[PDB]
Design a protein around this ligand. Structure first.
Ligand SMILES: [N]S(=O)(=O)[C][C][C][C][C][C]C1234B567B89%10B%11%12%13B85%14B%1158B%12%11%15B%139%12B%1061B%12%112C5%153B%14874
Ligand SMILES: [Zn+2]
Length: 257
């Protein structure tokens, strides 16, 4: 099955998922000097006050913090988006060392990690239908750098020991994702894809310019997770990022001057 090793990693994915070589793949490098300021872009509206987290799951590739998406409770709108996108889950991608881990890059800079808040367009009724549409998902991407601790992340960090291995989950209620946001909602946006198989070309990407800071100790705990299942040979869950893909016939737009 696909993963992030030598034998099953990103360079192999195209064999099972030929869209890996498609026209709107993610992530990409954001060349800051080429991205054009678009004064028509709106402020992003992030409405997470009623977000209801339920559970955290180690799926063998990352961990997902899952939300109740059976009503409009936590939604993303505005920015480049038409209509309303409901939060379903967030997860991260990270490295074995602080010098790599992000999926998007900024002028070729790699951050230590990248947070993805995944939302689906309510006009398609369910997530599985949304991923079949070119405007089905909106993913809000946030870079992580290592420095000061992020207090709002610590609840996530502290539950990771209970979901060490693939297929483990834990109750994870009352977690407030507002504590993971940077001060500024300035962003870049472009049309792209899921960064994991099946690599579907269904995503409007919204990547915040301002990173969040997390501590070395926080990211070190991400790196103690396992890709393997319980009792199997330990493979640390590190370097679970896809590298930048060709931009092809796409424009990255900036919300800010
Ligand atoms: N890293 S990222 O933020 O670009 C991607 C986040 C969303 C990935 C969704 C994957 C599937 B869900 B539905 B089905 B189940 B199985 B098939 B279909 B969607 B694709 C897979 B699972
Ligand atoms: Zn992701």
């Amino acid at each position: 099955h696909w993963g992030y090793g030598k034998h099953n990693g990103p360079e192999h994915w195209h064999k099972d998922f030929p869209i890996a070589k498609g026209e709107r793949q993610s992530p990409v490098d954001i060349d800051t000097h080429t991205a054009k300021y678009d004064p028509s872009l709106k402020p992003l509206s992030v409405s997470y006050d009623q977000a209801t987290s339920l559970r955290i799951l180690n799926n063998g590739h990352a961990f997902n913090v899952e939300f109740d998406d059976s009503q409009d409770k936590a939604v993303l709108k505005g920015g480049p988006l038409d209509g309303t996108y409901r939060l379903i889950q967030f997860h991260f991608h990270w490295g074995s060392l602080d010098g790599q881990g992000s999926e998007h890059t900024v002028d070729k800079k790699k951050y230590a990690a990248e947070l993805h808040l995944v939302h689906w367009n309510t006009k398609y009724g369910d997530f599985g239908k949304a991923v079949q549409q070119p405007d089905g998902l909106a993913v809000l991407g946030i870079f992580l750098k290592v420095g000061s601790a992020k207090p709002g992340l610590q609840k996530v960090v502290d539950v990771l020991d209970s979901i060490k291995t693939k297929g483990k989950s834990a109750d994870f209620t009352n977690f407030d994702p507002r504590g993971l946001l940077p001060e500024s909602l300035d962003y870049w946006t472009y049309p792209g894809s899921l960064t994991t198989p099946p690599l579907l070309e269904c995503v409007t990407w919204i990547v915040l310019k301002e990173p969040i800071s997390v501590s070395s100790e926080q990211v070190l705990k991400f790196r103690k997770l396992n890709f393997n299942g319980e009792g199997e040979p330990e493979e640390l869950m590190v370097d679970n990022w896809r590298p930048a893909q060709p931009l092809k016939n796409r424009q990255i737009k900036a919300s800010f001057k």
